[PDB]
Amino acid sequence: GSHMVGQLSRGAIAAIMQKGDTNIKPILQVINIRPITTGNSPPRYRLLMSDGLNTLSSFMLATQLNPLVEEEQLSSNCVCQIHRFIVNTLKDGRRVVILMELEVLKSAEAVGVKIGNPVPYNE
Ligand SMILES: O=C(O)c1cc(-c2ccc(CNC(=O)c3ccc(-c4ccc(C(=O)O)o4)cc3Cl)cc2)n(-c2ccc(Cl)c(Cl)c2)n1
Numbered sequence: 001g002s003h004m005v006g007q008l009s010r011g012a013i014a015a016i017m018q019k020g021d022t023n024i025k026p027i028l029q030v031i032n033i034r035p036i037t038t039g040n041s042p043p044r045y046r047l048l049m050s051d052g053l054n055t056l057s058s059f060m061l062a063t064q065l066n067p068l069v070e071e072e073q074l075s076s077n078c079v080c081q082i083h084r085f086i087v088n089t090l091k092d093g094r095r096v097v098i099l100m101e102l103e104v105l106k107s108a109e110a111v112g113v114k115i116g117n118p119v120p121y122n123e
Pocket of ligand 1: 057058060090095097
């Protein structure tokens with residue numbers, strides 16, 4: 001309904017990347033999903049997600065959840081609650097967030113637009 005950004009967990013992205021908070025179950029919007037280059041293994045999906053204030057592209061989907069993308073329940077504009085995630089830090093210092101359990105609260109078709117005016121999160 002009205003005040004759409006109020007439907008998203010504003011500040012959750014900073015909390016994940018700054019505080020290292022993994023107990024929260026934030027509500028985020030999917031902005032984009034694309035496959036990464038994989039090879040001889042199951043496909044892997046990378047997501048640009050929004051908390052209403054920030055976007056962050058460092059999300060990857062657990063392979064067990066691939067059917068959500070491939071059957072189109074999880075797609076651009078949908079609003080999701082993250083029930084379980086883990087953070088991994090690469091050798092170069094970048095962090096990636098692996099989404100392990102995810103619930104779609106509102107379908108892409110029921111939302112239909114990017115909520116608010118989130119800006120890219122910096123490191
Ligand atoms: O081609 C490409 O375009 C491509 C490639 C990559 C890529 C980069 C790093 C890695 C290293 N691997 C992991 O950080 C990892 C750790 C645990 C798990 C896991 C635990 C349980 C499960 C499960 O149940 O599925 O998965 C998964 C991963 Cl993928 C891999 C790819 N990237 C990429 C670059 C920069 C960012 Cl910020 C991101 Cl998000 C992705 N792009």
